[PDB]
C-alpha cells in the first residue's frame, strides 16, 4: 500500500502566524491532473474532520485560513493565520490506491505567553477512606509550557512510587494545559502520616508552588 | 443535521466477534457509500472498508478474511462484523459517510471504543474532592470528581448535568492493575459554593452506571 | 506533383518503393518496345502483366505516402488505414494472379504447346534485387509485407518458368509446365494467407489479437475499482499496426469518484497497450 | 454444412445470391465439359473465367450469411463489416477483369485473329436474369451493389463480344473488337468508381458522408450545454450501412451536472443519426 | 421553455397528516434514467431552501419526512408527518432544458384548532399628532382560521374609507395569523371625534370582540 | 458556514442600470458555479443566469441583451449588471451556489429587494403605540411600533436589539400615495412594563435611518 509520512511530527506556531504541514507519499497519488490526497483535522476527543479534498479544494464549511497545495508525492497543508482552535492533529489520506491509507499525523500545539500553574490539593474523601484506600489529588491547571514537575512530600519525605500523572491536551480557547497527579495509598499509610504536600516546578518561576494540608 | 451514530460493545473477549451498528440520519444509504475506519494509538487511523449503495463492499486486504459489512436501507443501518478479535484490534471505530464523488470522508460518527481483553466489566467508584478545610477561600474555588476502579473505557463525566461547562477539565484515564483511574476538575466562583448545589455525574455505559455525586464542604 | 517527390524520397520505405516501381515500369516499357519491334505476342502479354503487377507497387507506395498525412475533419483518424488497405489489396492481387497462373497451366496442359526465357531470367534478377531491398518487410508493416509477398510471387513464377524450360530442354518432359504452374500458384496462396488474415481482422473491426488475451484481466481490474458496478459495451479494434482504439461504458455508484475511476481505467488500459481510449461513466440510480 | 443451407434460404438476398451462384457454376461446368468433349481452348478459358467470376458471387453470398452472425469476444461489433468487404472485393474483382479485357483487346489488335458466340448469347441471357433479379441492388447495400455491378460487367462483356462478332461478320471490320473491348473496360471502371469510393471511405474510418455536414451543428449544440468547456478527440465512423459510431471527450466545469450533460449529448447525436456513442467526461481543475 | 404547473395552488393539511404537492411539466424533463426536477421550500421572509434534487434524492440536512417521486412529466412531493414549521411555499424547478424554470408555487397552510383573536387598540401617538396625522391601530393576533372581519366605529358611525389591512403569514410555531388594521385620519378629524372602536368578527364566536377608547 | 450576501441599491431609476455584488464565504469560486435568480410576485421565481468557475456565463434568453455577470476569484465576489431597468424588474434578487454536479441550487443568499420607480428615497417616520390609559392591564400587554412614510422597501424592525424576539409580529407593508406603511406588535409581560425598558428599532437601509424609539406609558 501507499505509505504516507507526515513531517514534522509536532510543529509549534504562535497565534496569527503561519503553520505548514507536509505529507510525503511513497508512490504518486495523482491521476490525470487530479491529486487524490485529502487533509483531515482531529481535535481532542472528537472524530476526524475533513478539511481538504483532492489536495487543494476547501471543504464547504471550514475556515478560509486553511489551504492545500502540492502534487505527485509532495503535499502541504497551510494554516494562515493560526488561531487558538487550530490546535489539533492533522492527518493526510490517499484515495489513489486501494486500500485507503492515512498519514502518521502531525500534532499542532499553540505558542503563547507562559502562565503559572494554578495548584489545588484535595485530600482523600471519607467514602474512599471507608472503602480502604486514600487518593490525594494535585490539580495543576492553566499553565504554559507543557513541561512541569510534580513532587509529593509526606511530612517532608519525598514519594515517587504510587504517583500517577495524567496530562490533558492543549485547550482550544486559552491554549493551556492541565496536569492531574494522584497519589494512591492504603488507609493505614494515610493514617500514619499527617502533613501531605505537593509542589509544582515550572519554568515561569524558580520558586515551586507548594500546596499543603494536614491530617 | 447529517449524523452517524455507532452502537456496539465496549468490551470484546479475545478471539470473539465484534458487532457494531451505525445508524444514519440526514441522508439515505441508497445514494451514499459508508466507510468503516478504526483509530488506535499503536497504528493510527486504518481504513477498514466501504459499503456502496447497491451493496458492493470493498475491504482492506489485511481484514478480508475476518470482516463483513452489510446494511439495511429501510431502517438506514450499517452492520460491521469482525471475527477473531485479538488485542491489537483495540481501537475507536467510526462509520463515516463518503464525500460524494470523492475518495474522502466528510461526515464521521462519534466512534465506539472497543477493547479486547479477558478482564470483566467493573462499575466505577466515584469520590468527591473538596478543598481542605476553609484555607485559601479566594474568589475561584476548584472542585474534583474522582472515578477509580472502572473497566473498560470510557466514562462520561459532566458537572451540573452539563450546565456548568466552563472551567471543566477532564483528564485522561490511567491504566493500573487492569483498572482505570480518571479525574475531573472544575473551577467555580467562591460565592456560589457551597451556596449553590453542584454535582458530578459519572456515566459508565459498559456497566450501565450513572452517579450524580453531590460534593459537600468538609 | 513536384512537392510529392521530395516527400517520397524523404522516407526509406517510400524511396525503396519508388525505386522498385521505376525499375518495374522501365522493364515493362522495354518489353513492350521489344515486342512491338520483334512482332511478338508473349512479350506483349508479359509486358501487360508486368504493368498490372507494378500497379500493386504503386498502391504500396501511395499508401506509404498518404499514411503520413495529417488528420482532418473527413478523416479524423488520419490516413493510416491506407497501410492496411495496401496489404489487403496486395494479397488480393496475389490471389488474382496465382489462380490465373493455375488457369494458364491447365490450358497449356489441354493444348499443344506450339524466346520468352532470357527475359524471364532478367525478371528473376529484378525480383532478387527486390528481395534484397525488402528483406526486412516480411505505419509500414502491411505495406512492406504485401510488397515482399508480391516480389516473392514474381520470383516463384520466374523460377517455375525457368525450371519448366530447363526440364523440357534437357530431358523433354512435356508435363513439367502444368505441375510447376499449379505448385507455384498453391505456394503463392499459402504465402498470402497470413497477411490476408491480419488485414481482414483489422478491417472487420476485430479485437486486436495481441490485446485479446490481456483484455479479461483488464476487465477484472476495472471491476475491482471502488464504486464500479459493471462494465458494458466494450469494443477494442486496430486502427493500424500497434495502434489500438478502445471504447467502454462503466456503471458506477451514484456517489462514485468518477475522476479517480476514469484515471484508473485509463492507466489499466494504457498498460495493456491501448493507445486511444474512451470511457463513458454512467451513475446508477441505486 | 447442412445447417448453413436453411440459413441461406431464409433470407431473400442470400437466396437470390445462392440461386445465381448455382446458375453460374452450372454454366461454367457445362462449358468445361463441352470444351473437353469438343477439344476447344476458348471454351476452357471462358469456363475458367466464369469460375473466377462466380468466386465474387461466392464472396457476396458468404458476406450476406456471415453479416447476421452474433457478436462475440473477438468480433465485438459482430460481422457486419463483411458486407463492406464484399463490395470492396467485388469492385476490385471488376478492376482486375476490365484491365485484362483491355489487355486482351490490345493483344487481339497486335495479332492476326485466327464458335464462342452461341455460348456468349447464353451468358448474356443469364446476365439478363441476374439484372432482373438484382435490379434493386444498384447490412446488404454493398453486397447487392457489388453483385449488380459484377453482373453489369458481365453483360457489357457479352454485348461487346456480340457486337464485335456481328460487325465483323456482316460488314467485316477487323478493328471493331479492340475498340469495343477498350470501351467496355472503361465503362466497367467508371461504373465501379462510386462503390469503391464508398467502401474505401468506410474502411479508412472516414467520417460518414451523410453525417459530416450535420456534425459542426452538433458540436455547436454540445458546446452550448451548461458547464461544458470544450470538445476534443471527436471521431465518427461507419461500421456498416447507416450504422455510425461516435466517440468524443468533453471537458466540463469541476461542479458540472455530468448526468444531464451526458444525456443531452446522447440526445444531440441520436437526432443526428449516430447509433452508438461514447462520451468521456473529464472534470477540469478550474 | 418548459412550463411547470403546480396543483393545487393551496392545500390544507392538519398536523401529523400527509401533504401531497404535484408538479406537471409541459415536456419531459428526464434524461437516460434521471429526472432533472428539484423541489424547494420557501418560508415567509426567507430565501428558497432546497429539499429534493433530481426528483427523488433527499438533500443532506432536511428532515426525512420529505419525500419525492415521479418521472417524465408527473412529479410529487410528499410530507409525512406534516409539522408546524412545514407551512411554507413549495416550488418545483426543472434543469433539463435551458433556461432553468420554476413552478408557480403551492402554499401550505396548517389546519389546527380555531383560536379567538386577541384584539389590542392603540390610539394615535402624540408625535404623530404633532406631525399632523392620526393613525389608530387594531392588532388581531393569534387567530385561526384566516378569514376575519374588522370594522371601525367613530362614536358608533362606521368607517370604510381610510382603513388599511395588513395580513401576516401563518406562524411556524403555533400556526396562527396576525391582522393589523390601521385607520389614517387628519388631526382635525381625530380631534372632532371622541370614541374610537374596532370590532373583530371571527368564526370562533358570533359575538364580535370590540376594543374601544376615548379621546 | 457557507454564506452568500448580496449588496446593491434598493431603488433604481427607470431605464437605468442595476449593479449587485454577491460576496461568498465557505467555498471558492474556482470550483463552484453561481446562479442569479429573481423572485417577484407577478412572475414568481425566474432564473436569470449562471457563471462558471472558469468564467463561462449562461444567461436566460429573455435577458441575453441586457444582462452581464462577471466575477473575481481573489476577493470571492460575483458582479451582476442589468441594463434598461423597467418597472417589471422590481424583485428580490438572489445569488445562489450551484449544487455540485446537479442542476439545483443548494445555498441561497438573503436576497436584495430592488424596485424601479421615479420616486425618491424617503426616511421612515417612527411612532409608538402604547395601550390606551391603564384599562385592561391583564398579564399580557401588547405594544406597537409604527413605521409610516418610508420609501423604498424594506425596513428591519426589532425589539430590544433582537433580545425580545418572542411574541414579535411584524406585518407586511402597504403602499399608499407611493409611500409605505408598516406595523409591528409585541406581547410582553405586564410586570415588566413599564418596569423594564423596551424599545423598537427601525433600520431603513435605503435612507440609512436607525430609530431606537423608546415606548413610554401614556
Numbering used by the authors:
A (entry chain D), E (entry chain C): 1 to 215
B (entry chain F), F (entry chain E): 1 to 218
C (entry chain B), D (entry chain A): 22 to 135, 140 to 163, 229 to 376
Which sentences from the paper describe this structure?
A monoclonal antibody Fab fragment that specifically and tightly binds to native-state hZnT7 was prepared, and the structures of the hZnT7-Fab complex were determined by single-particle cryo-EM analysis.
To prepare Zn2+-unbound hZnT7 uniformly, we purified hZnT7 throughout in the presence of 1 mM EDTA, and then assessed the structure of the hZnT7-Fab#1 complex using the JEOL CRYO ARM 300II. Thus, the major portion of Zn2+-unbound hZnT7 has been found to form a homodimer composed of two OF protomers (named OF-OF homodimer). At the dimer interface of hZnT7, TM2 of one protomer tightly interacts with TM3 of another protomer near the luminal side.
